[PDB]
Amino acid sequence: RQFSYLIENMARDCGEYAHTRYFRGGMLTNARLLFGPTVRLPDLIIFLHTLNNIFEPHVAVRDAAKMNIPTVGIVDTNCNPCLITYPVPGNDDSPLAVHLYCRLFQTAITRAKEKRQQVEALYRLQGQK
Amino acid sequence: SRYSPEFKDPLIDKEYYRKPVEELTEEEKYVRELKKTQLIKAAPAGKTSSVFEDPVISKFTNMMMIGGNKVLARSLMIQTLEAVKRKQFEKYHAASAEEQATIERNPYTIFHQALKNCEPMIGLVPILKGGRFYQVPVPLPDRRRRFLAMKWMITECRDKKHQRTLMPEKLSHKLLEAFHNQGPVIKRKHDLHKMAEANRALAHYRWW
Amino acid sequence: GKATDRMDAFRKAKNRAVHHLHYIERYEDHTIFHDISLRFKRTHIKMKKQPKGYGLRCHRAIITICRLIGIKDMYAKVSGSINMLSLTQGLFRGLSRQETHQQLADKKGLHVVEIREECGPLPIVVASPRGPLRKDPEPEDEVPDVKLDWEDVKTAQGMKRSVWSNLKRAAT
Amino acid sequence: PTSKRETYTEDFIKKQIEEFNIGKRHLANMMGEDPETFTQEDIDRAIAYLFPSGLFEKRARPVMKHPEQIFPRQRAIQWGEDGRPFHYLFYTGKQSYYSLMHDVYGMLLNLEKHQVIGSRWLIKEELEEMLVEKLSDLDYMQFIRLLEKLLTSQCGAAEEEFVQRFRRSVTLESKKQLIEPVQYDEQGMAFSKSEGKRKTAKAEAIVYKHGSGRIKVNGIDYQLYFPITQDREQLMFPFHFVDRLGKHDVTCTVSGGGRSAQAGAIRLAMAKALCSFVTEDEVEWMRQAGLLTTDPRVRERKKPGQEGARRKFTWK
Amino acid sequence: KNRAARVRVSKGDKPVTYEEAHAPHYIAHRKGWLSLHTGNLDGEDHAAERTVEDVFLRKFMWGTFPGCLADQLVLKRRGNQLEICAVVLRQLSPHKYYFLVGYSETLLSYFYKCPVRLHLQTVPSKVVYKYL
RNA sequence: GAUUAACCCAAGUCAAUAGAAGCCGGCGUAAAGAGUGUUUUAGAUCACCCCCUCCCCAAUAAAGCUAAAACUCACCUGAGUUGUAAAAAACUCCAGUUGACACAAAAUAGACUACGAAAGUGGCUUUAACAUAUCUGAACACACAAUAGCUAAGACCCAAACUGGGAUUAGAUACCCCACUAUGCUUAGCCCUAAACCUCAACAGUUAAAUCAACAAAACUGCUCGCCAGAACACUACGAGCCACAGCUUAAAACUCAAAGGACCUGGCGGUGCUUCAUAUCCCUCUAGAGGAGCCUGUUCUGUAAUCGAUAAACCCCGAUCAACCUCACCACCUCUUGCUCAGCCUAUAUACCGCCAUCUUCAGCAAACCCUGAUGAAGGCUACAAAGUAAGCGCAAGUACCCACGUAAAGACGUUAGGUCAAGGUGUAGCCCAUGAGGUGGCAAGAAAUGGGCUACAUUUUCUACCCCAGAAAACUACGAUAGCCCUUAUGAAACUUAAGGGUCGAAGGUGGAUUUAGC
Numbered sequence A: 001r002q003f004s005y006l007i008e009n010m011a012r013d014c015g016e017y018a019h020t021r022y023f024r025g026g027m028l029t030n031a032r033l034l035f036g037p038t039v040r041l042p043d044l045i046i047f048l049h050t051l052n053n054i055f056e057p058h059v060a061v062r063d064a065a066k067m068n069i070p071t072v073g074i075v076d077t078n079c080n081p082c083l084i085t086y087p088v089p090g091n092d093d094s095p096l097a098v099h100l101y102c103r104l105f106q107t108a109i110t111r112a113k114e115k116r117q118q119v120e121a122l123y124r125l126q127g128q129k
Numbered sequence B: 001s002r003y004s005p006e007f008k009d010p011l012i013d014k015e016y017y018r019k020p021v022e023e024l025t026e027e028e029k030y031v032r033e034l035k036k037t038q039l040i041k042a043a044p045a046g047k048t049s050s051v052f053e054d055p056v057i058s059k060f061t062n063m064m065m066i067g068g069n070k071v072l073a074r075s076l077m078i079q080t081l082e083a084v085k086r087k088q089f090e091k092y093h094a095a096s097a098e099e100q101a102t103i104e105r106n107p108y109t110i111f112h113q114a115l116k117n118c119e120p121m122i123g124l125v126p127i128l129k130g131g132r133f134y135q136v137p138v139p140l141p142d143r144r145r146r147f148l149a150m151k152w153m154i155t156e157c158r159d160k161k162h163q164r165t166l167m168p169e170k171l172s173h174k175l176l177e178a179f180h181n182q183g184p185v186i187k188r189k190h191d192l193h194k195m196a197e198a199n200r201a202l203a204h205y206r207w208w
Numbered sequence C: 001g002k003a004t005d006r007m008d009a010f011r012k013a014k015n016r017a018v019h020h021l022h023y024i025e026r027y028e029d030h031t032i033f034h035d036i037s038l039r040f041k042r043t044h045i046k047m048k049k050q051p052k053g054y055g056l057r058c059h060r061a062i063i064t065i066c067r068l069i070g071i072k073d074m075y076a077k078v079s080g081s082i083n084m085l086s087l088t089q090g091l092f093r094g095l096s097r098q099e100t101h102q103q104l105a106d107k108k109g110l111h112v113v114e115i116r117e118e119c120g121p122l123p124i125v126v127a128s129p130r131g132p133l134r135k136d137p138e139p140e141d142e143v144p145d146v147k148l149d150w151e152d153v154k155t156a157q158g159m160k161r162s163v164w165s166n167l168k169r170a171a172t
Numbered sequence D: 001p002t003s004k005r006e007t008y009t010e011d012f013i014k015k016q017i018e019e020f021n022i023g024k025r026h027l028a029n030m031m032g033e034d035p036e037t038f039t040q041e042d043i044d045r046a047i048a049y050l051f052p053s054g055l056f057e058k059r060a061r062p063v064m065k066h067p068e069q070i071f072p073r074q075r076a077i078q079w080g081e082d083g084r085p086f087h088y089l090f091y092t093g094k095q096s097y098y099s100l101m102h103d104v105y106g107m108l109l110n111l112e113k114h115q116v117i118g119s120r121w122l123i124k125e126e127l128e129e130m131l132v133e134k135l136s137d138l139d140y141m142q143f144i145r146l147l148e149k150l151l152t153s154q155c156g157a158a159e160e161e162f163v164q165r166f167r168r169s170v171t172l173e174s175k176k177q178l179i180e181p182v183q184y185d186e187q188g189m190a191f192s193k194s195e196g197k198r199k200t201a202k203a204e205a206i207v208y209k210h211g212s213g214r215i216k217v218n219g220i221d222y223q224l225y226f227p228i229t230q231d232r233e234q235l236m237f238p239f240h241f242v243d244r245l246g247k248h249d250v251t252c253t254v255s256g257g258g259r260s261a262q263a264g265a266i267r268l269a270m271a272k273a274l275c276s277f278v279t280e281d282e283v284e285w286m287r288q289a290g291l292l293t294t295d296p297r298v299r300e301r302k303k304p305g306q307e308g309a310r311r312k313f314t315w316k
Numbered sequence E: 001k002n003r004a005a006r007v008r009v010s011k012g013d014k015p016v017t018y019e020e021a022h023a024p025h026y027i028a029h030r031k032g033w034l035s036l037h038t039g040n041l042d043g044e045d046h047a048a049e050r051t052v053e054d055v056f057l058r059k060f061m062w063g064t065f066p067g068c069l070a071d072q073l074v075l076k077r078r079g080n081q082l083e084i085c086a087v088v089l090r091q092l093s094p095h096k097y098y099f100l101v102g103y104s105e106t107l108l109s110y111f112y113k114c115p116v117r118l119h120l121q122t123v124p125s126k127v128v129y130k131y132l
Numbered sequence F: 001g002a003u004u005a006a007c008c009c010a011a012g013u014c015a016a017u018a019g020a021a022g023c024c025g026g027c028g029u030a031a032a033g034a035g036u037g038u039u040u041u042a043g044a045u046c047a048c049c050c051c052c053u054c055c056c057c058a059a060u061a062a063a064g065c066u067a068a069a070a071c072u073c074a075c076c077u078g079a080g081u082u083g084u085a086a087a088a089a090a091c092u093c094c095a096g097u098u099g100a101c102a103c104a105a106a107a108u109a110g111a112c113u114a115c116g117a118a119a120g121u122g123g124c125u126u127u128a129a130c131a132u133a134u135c136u137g138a139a140c141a142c143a144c145a146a147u148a149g150c151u152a153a154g155a156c157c158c159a160a161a162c163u164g165g166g167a168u169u170a171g172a173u174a175c176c177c178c179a180c181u182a183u184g185c186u187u188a189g190c191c192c193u194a195a196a197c198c199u200c201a202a203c204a205g206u207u208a209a210a211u212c213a214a215c216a217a218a219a220c221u222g223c224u225c226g227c228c229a230g231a232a233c234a235c236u237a238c239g240a241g242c243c244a245c246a247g248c249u250u251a252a253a254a255c256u257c258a259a260a261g262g263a264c265c266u267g268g269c270g271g272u273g274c275u276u277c278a279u280a281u282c283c284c285u286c287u288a289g290a291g292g293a294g295c296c297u298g299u300u301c302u303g304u305a306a307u308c309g310a311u312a313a314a315c316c317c318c319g320a321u322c323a324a325c326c327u328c329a330c331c332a333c334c335u336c337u338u339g340c341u342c343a344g345c346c347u348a349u350a351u352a353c354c355g356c357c358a359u360c361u362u363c364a365g366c367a368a369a370c371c372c373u374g375a376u377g378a379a380g381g382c383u384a385c386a387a388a389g390u391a392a393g394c395g396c397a398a399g400u401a402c403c404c405a406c407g408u409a410a411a412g413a414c415g416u417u418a419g420g421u422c423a424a425g426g427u428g429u430a431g432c433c434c435a436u437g438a439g440g441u442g443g444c445a446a447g448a449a450a451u452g453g454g455c456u457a458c459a460u461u462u463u464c465u466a467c468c469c470c471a472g473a474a475a476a477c478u479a480c481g482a483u484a485g486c487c488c489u490u491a492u493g494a495a496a497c498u499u500a501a502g503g504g505u506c507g508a509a510g511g512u513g514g515a516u517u518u519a520g521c
C-alpha cells in the first residue's frame, strides 16, 4: 500500500497499466466473463512485490503461468522465484529501491516506444521514395 | 404501532416550558431546540394538563377497569375518594380537640400513603436448581412493588367474601385500614416477608 | 465434469480438457522413447517400448488415450488399484517426463546409437549432441546396481505360468 | 442459449432519437398544438388521455419518453481495435472507483507538503450512476472516509468544489404549524377556522378572538353535549396550556365517530385555530405538547383466518 | 405454497409472456383485464351470461385458429357490439385467415344475436417478455 | 412362465464337478514388530581406518531414619457430630482446642525431563552397585515382568470388591450416603497376565529424487530377526507343557456369509460447548380466557338395514359462505336397458398425475454458466490495513393496495413431509357394461361414554326499567342464572313433535374451576 500511489502514476506516465488493489479471483483465468470475449490480456506482467499482505505469493504469479504470460519480478529473500520467468533479486521494501526500479522500468519502456517511431518513420519515409 | 420510531412521546408538563431561558442549562437549552425538529405523538385522552391530575390514581383506575368501561372505573374511584373524605369528617367532628390534629382528611394523601404501606421490599421468585423449583428471596424492583400494592388491594376487594358490599365502600374501608398499618393487604405483605426471611438459606441459588 | 445432468457434464469436461493439454513425445511417431515404470499414489503402471506391428496390449483405457496421443505400439501392465483417475493422471505424468534421445545426447555429450537384430551389427545414429562431443567414454561397469522387476526376470527365465497371458485378441 | 441480455448500441439508440422527434410532431398534430413549444409534460398529458390506464404501478403504464431516460446507461467499449484499454486501471475491474480514490489520495498528500446542515453524503445508489460501476457497501464507506479526512484538513478552494459534488442536498420541511388567516364577520369580530380529525370523527371549529369562554357544539352547550368530564377536560386542555381560559368564544360542529372521538377532533380544531391568536413561541409549545398533531391510530382490520385484527383462533 | 397462475422457475430456457409472467396479485397493478364489460359494476346485471360467452369464445377461437394464437384474447363490449382482438402468428396463409374471419364473425353473430367483429394483429413469433 | 424376434456356438450345445494361472508384497490405525533382555549354531558388512555428551538429576537391593496429616489415649470445655442437588440411616465414652504418639503413604521443588532391559522409578542418609571395544540373534533355553490373585505367618492409620443397612426408581442385584471385610503393606514361596500401546522392531545411514492414497507422529535406503495372508467361529475345542486345577501359554477345523474392515466427506442428530439472542416469545413477568357447570357444535367409540373424505405439529363450526324432501354419493324394495350424451360409472389407485393448497416461511436463501483449490477423490470456496471467487435469473428487498415514510394486508423462491384432495372438474392405468350404470317410492343419520372448540353464566364494576351516562327500584329457596325441556301460536314451504322466531310455563346444575394449557405489544 505504501507504493500503490507511486506505481499507478508511473504506469500512467509510461502509458502502461497497473493493479495495486485487491486481486479479484478470475481477472486472468476468467477475463472473458468479467471483461468480455474480445478482451486482450497483458503480454507482460511486472511484479514489483511478489508477495501479498499475508506474506504469501501473489495469485497472479500462478495465474499468469496458466495463461502463458511472461512475468518479471523483484524477488526478495523470502520470495518464491520458481514461476517467475525473469527474476531480479533485490530489496522490495525500502522506498529508495522501489523508486529506482520504477525509474528504470519506466525509462526502458518509454525508450522503446520512442525507438519504434524512429524506425517506422524511416521505413515509411524510405519506402515512399 | 401506527407511529414511526421518529415520533417521540409528548411532555404535558406545563411549568417546564414556562421555565425562563435564563435558567435553561446548556444541555437543557440544546434539548429544547432539538425537539422542534422532532415529530411528537398526539397526547392520549387519559392525561391532561390539569392541576388535579394524579398519575397514581389514573393507573389505579386503569387496573380496575373491565372491558374498556372507564366511566365506571373512574366513577368507583371518585366515590371511594368521597367515601374516605366523608368518613374522616365524621371522625373529626366526634374527636377531641387534641385528636383532630392527627386526623388526615385529604383522600389523596391517604391513597398514596396506604399504597406505600403495602409495598413489599423483597419477593419470592422460583429458580430451577437441581431439577427443582425453589422460592428464593429476590429484591423486587421499585415498579414491581408499586404494582403489587395496587393489584393486592383490587384482588382483596374483588374477593367474594363480602356478600353484598359496593366497591367504593370496600376500597374505602381497606384504604383506611392500610393507612393505619392494618388489614389483610398489609398482612399479605408480612406473609411474603415471613417466607422470604425463613427461606434466606436459598438466597445464593440466584445469580443476577 | 460434474453436473446434475449427464449431458451437461460432458460439455464442461470436454471443453476444459483443451485448456489442460499435454504434449507427448513419440519415437518415430508410433511409440515411447523408453520403458516407463512409475507409481501414482497406489496405482502402478509399467509401460514398455515395442516395435511396429506389436499393437496396443494395455488396459482398455490406456488404449483409448494412446489412440488420442498417437501411440500405436506399446505394452502396459497396471497393478495396485485400478482407479481410472489415478491411471489417467499417472499415465500423462510418466508420458510427459520421458527423456528423448536428443536430450540424452546433450545431457551426456555422446552419440545415441540404435542396434537392431534385423539390421545386424550396423550402428544407427538416432541422435547426436549439438555441443562439444565428449572425447572420453562412459566408464564401463562390470555389474550394474539397477533394481530389477521379478515379473520380467521370471518371464525371461521361463517361469511365468499364466493361462491369460499372450491370448489371441482383436486388433487394437 | 435463448436468453441474452438486451444490449443497446449507439447506432440503435441513435435511430430511437429520430423516431421520438417524429412521434413528437405527430402527437402535436393530433392534439392541435404547436410542435415547437411541445414539452414533455404535454406528452405525458396526451398519452394519458389517448391511452387511459388505471394501473396502480406508474411504471407499467404507457410512456413516450426520450430514449436517454428509458434505456439504461451502459458501460461503453473499453478498448480500441488494437485491444489496448484506454484507462490505465482497466484490469482492476473498477477503474472509475479506483481512479477517484487515486485522485483523492493524491490531494491529501499535497496538503501535507505545503502545510453542515442541509447537506448529506451521496448515497451508494447515487454513486454508481456517476461511475457506472457496481459498488459494494464496504467500498462506499472507504470512499466516504477519505472525503471526511479531506474536510478536516485545511483544504484549498479547489478541493471544496470536488467534495461538494458528492454532497447531495436534503430539503427539510420546517416543523412549524401553518397559521390560519384571521377573518372578520359581518359584525366585525375576528376569528379563525380550522378542521380536525380523530378516528372517524371530523370537526370544524371557529375561534373568536374575544369571548367569554362559551363553546357551542352543534348548537348545544358543551357541558350538555359532553356529559362525561373527560370530554370536557379535552376541550379545556388547549386553552389551559396557553393560560387563556375564558377569553375566546368557540362555535364548532362535529360529525361522526363516538363520544371520545368527537372531543379529540374538536381539541385539534380549536388548537389549530387558536394558534392564530398566540405568539410563535406558544405555537411551538403546543406542537411539543401533542395538541397540533393528528392521531393516526385507527381501527385495524380483521383477517380472514383469525378471530380478530391480531387475535388468533385457539390453537388446538 | 400458492400455485395459481404462476409459472415455476426453470433453468432459463422457458419463454413466458407478460401476462403469463405475472401472478394474480398483479392483475390490477401491472396487468389489465382480458374482458371488459359492465356486468360486474355496482348495480349492473347479467354478469353470469357475459361470463359464459367469454369462456366459449376463448375456446371457439382456440380451436378455430389452431396453432395461430400467440397470446390470449382481449374481448371488448360496447353496447350491442362485441369486439374480439387477437394476436396471431404469420405461419398461416392470409387466404385462410380471411375465411376464418368471415366464418367466425358470422357464426358468432347468429349464435349470440349481436354484431361481432374480429381484429387480427399478426406477429412473426411469440413475443417473449423474459425467460424463466 | 408362454409366445414372437434376435444373439453366440454348432453336430453339437454346456448344467454339475475337477483341474490348469498363485511366494521378491506387507506389519502406526486395515490381518501382522508376538511384554523385556542375553546368548548359542549361524548370518550380515553398519567391525581396522575415522573422530564428538565418561561423571551428576527420580535404576536396583539391604539397613536405619522422619516432616506434614491421621488414629488412639488423657485433660479442659461444649451438646451434638457425620452426610448433601436434597434427605434418611448411622454415631452420641461424640465434637473442638492443646499435648503425647506408625511395620501406612511419601505436598512444593517438577514450567525439570533424568535413571533403568522393560515393568517401573520422584521423602532423608549410608553401603554395594548400573553387562559388552562390530552388529543381529528365541512364545518354548536362561533370567526378569504393573495391578489383581493363591498359600503361610505378622501388622493395621486410611481406603476398599463382597456383604449389610439407608435412599432413588415402574424395578435398581446400579450410580448417591453409611459401616465393615478380603485385599493394598512386611517376610517367604508361587502365579506369569495388560489398550505390558510412544500400537510405530534391532543396528547403520540419508534429506536429494517421483514429497506423499487418507488420517496420525514427513518420506526413504541397506541389513537382519520375528510375524501376517477375507470375516466370523476363536484370547475357543483337542493335544502337550507348567508349584498354575473356574488357570496360563501354544492353537485348528467343520457348519456359515459375500462381505468384514481402515481412513476421510456431506448431512442429520446430540439429556453437545462457548458467545449472543428471543418482545407476545423459550421461561419468569403483565391482561383476558380454557380445563369445572349447562347448552350449541364437531370428532371418536358404541349402535343402526343405512355414506365418503380430513384426522400429531399442519384434523376436529375442517370440504359445508351449511343435510326436513331435493342436496344424496348411503340403505331397503320395485323398475329400465344403445340408456340426457357418437353412452355411462361419486368404481380402485392422491404411492401415476395436472389443477388448487397446507407446512417449515413469524425463513433467507436458490441457481444457470464460467473460474480456481484439493497432486484433477467425495467435496470445498472468507478475512476490507482483504488471503479465489465472479454471477444473469428466482426469491427476499424495492415498488404497489389500504388512512403516509409507520403499520397491516398481499407476496413469499428451491426444496421437505411419496403431506391433502380421483367425491370440484379433468385425467393415465386396471376394472364393471341386464350393471360397479340409470331412474322412482320410503327411510336412517341416534346417544351409555369420552374428547375438542365455542356460547351463556355463576352476579353487585351486578339485575330490571327510564334514559343513552347527575335517576329510581331489585338483591339468595318468588334473587342472579338455560339460546335447554314442556305447551301453544306464527314465518317459510307441497310437506315442520321436527327448521327458525316469539310468547307462556318451568327456575336445574352452577357460587369461579385439578393436572395442565391458549392468544395478544
Ligand SMILES: CN[C@@H]1[C@H](O[C@H]2[C@H](O[C@H]3[C@H](O)[C@@H](O)[C@H](NC(=N)N)[C@@H](O)[C@@H]3NC(=N)N)O[C@@H](C)[C@]2(O)C=O)O[C@@H](CO)[C@H](O)[C@H]1O
Pocket: F257, F259
Ligand atoms: C451390495 N449388496 C449388499 C449386501 O446384500 C447382501 C446381503 O447379504 C446378507 C446375507 O444374505 C445373509 O445371509 C447374511 N447373514 C448372516 N447371518 N451371515 C448377512 O450378513 C449378509 N449381509 C451383509 N454381509 N451385509 O443380503 C443378501 C441377500 C445380499 O443382497 C446378497 O447380495 O448387504 C446388504 C446389507 O446386509 C446391503 O443392503 C446390500 O446393498
Ligand SMILES: [K+]
Pocket: F197
Ligand atoms: K498407547
Ligand SMILES: [K+]
Pocket: none
Ligand atoms: K455432523
Ligand SMILES: [K+]
Pocket: F290
Ligand atoms: K373457565
Ligand SMILES: [K+]
Pocket: none
Ligand atoms: K365448560
Ligand SMILES: [K+]
Pocket: none
Ligand atoms: K399434489
Ligand SMILES: [K+]
Pocket: F422
Ligand atoms: K381417475
Ligand SMILES: [K+]
Pocket: F422, F425
Ligand atoms: K377428480
Ligand SMILES: [K+]
Pocket: F454
Ligand atoms: K369451552
Ligand SMILES: [K+]
Pocket: none
Ligand atoms: K341478563
Ligand SMILES: [Mg+2]
Pocket: A076, A077, A091, A092, A093
Ligand atoms: Mg521484502
Ligand SMILES: [Mg+2]
Pocket: D308
Ligand atoms: Mg376482541
Ligand SMILES: [Mg+2]
Pocket: none
Ligand atoms: Mg491390526
Ligand SMILES: [Mg+2]
Pocket: none
Ligand atoms: Mg512392542
Ligand SMILES: [Mg+2]
Pocket: none
Ligand atoms: Mg501380549
Ligand SMILES: [Mg+2]
Pocket: F106, F123
Ligand atoms: Mg514426600
